[PDB]
Amino acid sequence: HMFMAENRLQLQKGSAEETIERFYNRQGIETIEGFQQMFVTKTLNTEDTDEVKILTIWESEDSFNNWLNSDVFKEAHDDGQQSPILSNKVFKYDIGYHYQK
Amino acid sequence: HMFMAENRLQLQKGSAEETIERFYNRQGIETIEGFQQMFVTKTLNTEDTDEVKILTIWESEDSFNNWLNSDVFKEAVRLKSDDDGQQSPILSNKVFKYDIGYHYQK
């Protein structure tokens, strides 16, 4: 039923505070039918690197795919600066149970 | 600000669905001041094992801690399809905690 997509980013240890806020940009994700929620998290107590996750909740995986194929997605997405992002991966999940007070 | 706790379960392949069923019973979590949401997920496209995550969203970490030390938690599962004594095929149960820097709900 409900679907969750995760964009897991590994950053240079300590670079989260200065890098993270950029991921708070929705960039029109809420204009996609089926989009429900978005969370941007920073993992506590990591030592090797800083870990940032962008979680998006959808009514279905089709909704998510439509987002990927949308124009708002296409539109979205100092020189020489070494990037703070070490890895960028995507994971997909079926939400088997959800409850909101 | 907002806080997310995660219980990450590695499971015998094929047991994801049954395991999520054991979590339909929130065991009074919503009675805790600060509790906001719960998500129980199954990781897609895994090969040799299953993965289920129990994510709980809170107003603060203190709220989450209050749940763990609450009477409802300390006093709170078996499925109808279980044989007496059957165990959830858990390979590992790990805990992770997160600060939620941003949240948006349509």
UniProtKB/Swiss-Prot annotation, chain B:
GO CC entries: cytoplasm
Site (Transition state stabilizer): W67
Subcellular location: Cytoplasm
Domain ABM: residue ranges: 3-91
Keyword presence, Heme: yes
A single GO molecular function term of this UniProt record: heme oxygenase (decyclizing) activity
Pfam families linked to this entry: ABM (PF03992)
Known catalytic reactions: heme b + 5 AH2 + 4 O2 + 2 H(+) = delta-staphylobilin + Fe(2+) + formaldehyde + 5 A + 4 H2O; heme b + 5 AH2 + 4 O2 + 2 H(+) = beta-staphylobilin + Fe(2+) + formaldehyde + 5 A + 4 H2O
EC number: 1.14.99.48
UniProt KW keywords: Cytoplasm, Heme, Iron, Metal-binding, Monooxygenase, Oxidoreductase
Residues at which heme binds: R22, F23, Y24, N25, R26, Q27, G28, I29
Biological process per Gene Ontology, one example term: iron import into cell
Residues annotated to bind Fe cation: N7
Keyword presence, Membrane: no
NCBIfam families from the UniProt entry: PRK13313.1 (NF009838)
Protein family: Belongs to the antibiotic biosynthesis monooxygenase family. Heme-degrading monooxygenase IsdG subfamily.
Function in brief: Allows bacterial pathogens to use the host heme as an iron source. Catalyzes the oxidative degradation of the heme macrocyclic porphyrin ring to the oxo-bilirubin chromophore staphylobilin (a mixture of the linear tetrapyrroles 5-oxo-delta-bilirubin and 15-oxo-beta-bilirubin) in the presence of a suitable electron donor such as ascorbate or NADPH--cytochrome P450 reductase, with subsequent release of free iron.
Quaternary context: Homodimer.
Note, other: IsdI seems to carry out oxygenation of the heme without the assistance of any of the prosthetic groups or cofactors normally associated with activation of molecular oxygen.
Protein name according to UniProt: Heme oxygenase (staphylobilin-producing) 2
Phylogenetic placement of the source organism: Bacteria, Bacillati, Bacillota, Bacilli, Bacillales
Gene: isdI
